[PDB]
Design a protein around this nucleic acid. Structure first.
Ligand SMILES: [K+]
Ligand SMILES: [K+]
Ligand SMILES: [K+]
Ligand SMILES: [K+]
Ligand SMILES: [K+]
Ligand SMILES: [K+]
Ligand SMILES: [K+]
Ligand SMILES: [K+]
Ligand SMILES: [K+]
Ligand SMILES: [Mg+2]
Ligand SMILES: [Mg+2]
Ligand SMILES: [Mg+2]
Ligand SMILES: [Mg+2]
Ligand SMILES: [Mg+2]
Ligand SMILES: [Mg+2]
Ligand SMILES: [Mg+2]
Ligand SMILES: [Mg+2]
Ligand SMILES: [Mg+2]
Ligand SMILES: [Mg+2]
Ligand SMILES: [Mg+2]
Ligand SMILES: [Mg+2]
Ligand SMILES: [Mg+2]
Ligand SMILES: [Mg+2]
Ligand SMILES: [Mg+2]
Ligand SMILES: [Mg+2]
Ligand SMILES: [Mg+2]
Ligand SMILES: [Mg+2]
Ligand SMILES: [Mg+2]
Ligand SMILES: [Mg+2]
Ligand SMILES: [Mg+2]
Ligand SMILES: [Mg+2]
Ligand SMILES: [Mg+2]
Ligand SMILES: [Mg+2]
Ligand SMILES: [Mg+2]
Ligand SMILES: [Mg+2]
Ligand SMILES: [Mg+2]
Ligand SMILES: [Mg+2]
Ligand SMILES: [Mg+2]
Ligand SMILES: [Mg+2]
Ligand SMILES: [Mg+2]
Lengths: 55, 94, 95, 45, 122, 94
RNA sequence: GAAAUUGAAACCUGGCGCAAUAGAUAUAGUACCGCAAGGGAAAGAUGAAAAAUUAUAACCAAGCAUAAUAUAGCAAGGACUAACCCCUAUACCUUCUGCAUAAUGAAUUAACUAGAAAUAACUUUGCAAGGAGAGCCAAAGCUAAGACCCCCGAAACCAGACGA
RNA sequence: CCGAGCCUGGUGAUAGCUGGUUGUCCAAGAUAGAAUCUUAGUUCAACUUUAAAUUUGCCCACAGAACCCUCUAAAUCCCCUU
RNA sequence: CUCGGAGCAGAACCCAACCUCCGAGCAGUACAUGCUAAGACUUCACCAGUCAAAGCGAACUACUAUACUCAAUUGAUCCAAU
């Protein structure tokens, strides 16, 4: 359910998850469906991260 | 024919190998402007460069490894000297 | 195995598997050792204890029994005071 | 906001959507294999 | 039964006569090898096929440089009958960054850092 | 009238095979090459103790690249433009 | 392989059916075959007008004819001024450890003649601790779609008829 | 055309057996055994294929792996480095 | 026709022949050969088989006492008896 510039979301996600993983995460951007797919389990980290952002 | 003779002269056994007959450009523009390099020569130039860099990389690793081993031997010798010092002996010898 | 029944057109369950094996919802199958009630007088207590154990099945046997049973036996059950309730889910499993 | 506005105004300059230019999403229609040809014929797997 | 072959260490002990024949200097051993495969790996046991791949000798008559160290030499001793081993010579020393693109490996085992494709004026 | 029983090159009775002059020379030529290989394997540049660990850093980094490429597999990105460009199949002149 | 229980829709005149080896066997259960029960075909093609019949041109399989043949060889290839002469080359399918094999099938042409589907899993959408247009599944699941499973052949067995 | 008629039906009987199995192109690909009225077949391993996860795999330095016994075998296992 | 030892198969494992040899289908002593539980082995799959620290409960301060001696010394499911 991502609207607008999904590529902006990917850079923010990569910046946020880089310290935790120690490397750039492997992500897939689906412009058609507005879906960002990330390798690994980061649901709890991203839910709090998106909640802080105001979403 | 003549492969062994070419080796004795320091040349490639196959005349199509390294040399002016192969590596030089086959043609140039009539006004004198040089032609673009042949695709075969570009492949050989890149392949030779990788071989040259591999020679340097192997040489530097062995040089670095020899220094590291020599550094360890020097360090091992120094450690023996320090342990010699201790408290002055006493008893019968005093 | 009956892949398409003659009256309903549905896959049937081999009831021999049900009477012998228990499928944990995690995908594992639990069975009893063969001959654990046979000739106990000639078997050492160390051997007899191993026969009384409830062991798991390997990937091939577990996959075989999945094909021989319908989706009814793979559903999640909430039996009251189920002895095997704690074994229906995996913990700290990697890969 | 390059996801919503950009995906629509780009559609303005494209030909009208009709029944003659509809395709399934890639990867959603796996090709059908038939026992024809040298590869999948003969003993047919 | 056909098994792997244990080569005695006496085979790899150079006599003074050998040094004069091949010109090598035991006190200054060559740093690098020039290994070229001149024999096919077919009709040879699989362990010889694997070692050829490890040494990067898949294509015959393609020179490959390897370090003259006991571990590398151990692999060479297994497939010594399939390869030609020559010492790498550096008449002008190791190539530098300036002359990396002007190097050539001659048939004599010498790596020349300058390659002008011109006859000598001498 | 002179026939080999069974197949020629297999069995208890075989067709005799003889070594020609050039057959010997070819074997001797390859024997000389291997003899020179024995000489060049008799002079290692470093001992086993000196060699140890001199290339561990590069070998470890080489395998980390293999691990990185192995764990980087993922479906490629999907773009709206690629899906929308399929409408051009019915583009016509006005 | 149930049952209790549950409980919906229902406007004939349509076709991502066949088009003369197809679609019924069918132009017909006729011709023909059998004592009988029974088995069971093949095919037609002008045009607005035949009360326009010197009409409706032509080109297309195998088979021939126009037009037999010239050293030598899986009949071809490389070629060549030149068809051949020169050089190179042990048909195909099946079956096998292995087939030019003197193992199998095939005169040839046209038409017909042989991969059907669950269980999960994967891939791509939807929605999401929910999914699904009552049922079912669910400790990221669930719903929907795509995608995998041939042809011919016995000697027999049984039931009911028809035959001295 | 009788070691037991013929016709129809069950019937598209069944066949671990034989034969056949239709467009183009590319890629990976030859594999210890065990059980079986089983060795003309199957199932499980092994091998092979695809997708996926993440981490060592192969080649191998010392050190190390038995007495009894006639061949005091070629070698193997283990194994950092590379 | 199943099981075990030895040679073939000399040194980790494995390895066939209607190959060369010898055996097994028990016996004896206990009556904690009670219970339970880390980590392992495994007859090339599976089934089956094998070894086990700690702990509970015993034994025990004499008892090479703590999963008997022994090489094989054996038979799945269904079913039947209780
Ligand atoms: K095929
Ligand atoms: K193939
Ligand atoms: K012979
Ligand atoms: K055939
Ligand atoms: K046959
Ligand atoms: K023959
Ligand atoms: K034959
Ligand atoms: K025949
Ligand atoms: K069979
Ligand atoms: Mg064919
Ligand atoms: Mg003969
Ligand atoms: Mg008809
Ligand atoms: Mg009619
Ligand atoms: Mg014709
Ligand atoms: Mg000829
Ligand atoms: Mg010929
Ligand atoms: Mg045969
Ligand atoms: Mg042949
Ligand atoms: Mg003939
Ligand atoms: Mg034939
Ligand atoms: Mg035959
Ligand atoms: Mg015919
Ligand atoms: Mg199917
Ligand atoms: Mg399917
Ligand atoms: Mg037939
Ligand atoms: Mg009967
Ligand atoms: Mg009857
Ligand atoms: Mg009469
Ligand atoms: Mg009769
Ligand atoms: Mg059949
Ligand atoms: Mg049969
Ligand atoms: Mg291939
Ligand atoms: Mg039996
Ligand atoms: Mg078999
Ligand atoms: Mg190994
Ligand atoms: Mg290692
Ligand atoms: Mg032995
Ligand atoms: Mg082995
Ligand atoms: Mg095992
Ligand atoms: Mg204890």
């Amino acid at each position: 359910k991502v609207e607008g510039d999904i590529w902006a979301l990917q850079k923010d996600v990569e910046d946020f998850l880089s310290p935790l993983l120690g490397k750039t995460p492997v992500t897939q951007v689906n412009e058609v469906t507005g879906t960002l797919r990330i390798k690994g389990y980061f649901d709890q980290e991203l839910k709090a991260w998106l909640l802080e952002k105001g979403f | 024919a003549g492969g062994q003779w070419r080796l004795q002269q320091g040349l490639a056994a196959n005349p199509s190998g390294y040399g002016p007959l192969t590596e030089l450009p086959d043609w140039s523009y009539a006004d004198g402007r040089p032609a673009p390099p042949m695709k075969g020569q570009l492949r050989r130039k890149a392949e030779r460069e990788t071989f040259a860099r591999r020679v340097v990389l192997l040489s530097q690793e062995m040089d670095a490894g020899l220094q590291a081993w020599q550094l360890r031997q020097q360090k091992l010798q120094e450690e023996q000297r320090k342990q010699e010092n201790a408290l002055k002996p006493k008893g019968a010898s005093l | 195995l009956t892949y398409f029944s003659a009256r309903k057109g549905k896959r049937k369950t081999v009831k021999a598997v049900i009477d012998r094996f228990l499928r944990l919802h995690c995908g594992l199958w639990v069975r009893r050792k063969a001959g654990y009630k046979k000739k106990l007088w000639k078997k050492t207590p160390a051997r007899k204890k191993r026969l009384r154990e409830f062991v798991f099945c390997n990937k091939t046997q577990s996959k075989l029994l999945d094909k021989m049973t319908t989706s009814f036996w793979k559903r999640r059950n909430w039996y009251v005071d189920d002895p095997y309730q704690k074994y229906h889910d995996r913990t700290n499993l990697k890969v | 906001q390059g996801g919503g506005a950009r995906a629509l105004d780009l559609l303005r300059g494209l030909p009208r959507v009709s029944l003659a230019n509809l395709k399934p999403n890639p990867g959603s229609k796996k090709p059908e294999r038939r026992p024809r040809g040298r590869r999948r014929g003969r003993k047919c797997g | 039964k056909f098994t792997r072959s244990r080569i005695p260490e006496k085979v790899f002990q150079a006599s003074p006569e050998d040094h004069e024949k091949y010109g090598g200097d035991p006190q200054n051993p060559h740093k690098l090898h020039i290994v070229t495969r001149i024999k096919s790996t077919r009709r040879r046991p699989y362990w010889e096929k694997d070692i050829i791949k490890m040494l990067g000798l898949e294509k015959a008559h393609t020179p490959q440089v390897h370090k003259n160290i006991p571990s590398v030499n151990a692999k060479l001793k297994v497939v010594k009958h399939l390869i030609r081993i020559k010492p790498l010579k550096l008449p002008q020393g190791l190539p530098a960054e300036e002359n990396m693109s002007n190097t050539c490996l001659k048939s004599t085992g010498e790596l020349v850092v300058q390659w002008h494709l011109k006859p000598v004026e001498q | 009238r002179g026939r080999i029983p069974g197949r020629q090159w297999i069995g208890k009775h075989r067709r005799p095979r003889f070594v020609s002059l050039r057959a010997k020379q070819n074997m001797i030529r390859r024997l000389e090459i291997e003899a020179e290989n024995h000489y060049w394997l008799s002079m290692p540049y470093m001992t086993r103790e000196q060699e140890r660990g001199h290339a561990a850093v590069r070998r470890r980094e080489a395998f980390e690249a293999i691990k990185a490429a192995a764990t980087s597999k993922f479906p490629p990105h999907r773009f709206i433009a690629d899906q929308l460009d399929h409408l051009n199949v019915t583009k016509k002149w006005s």
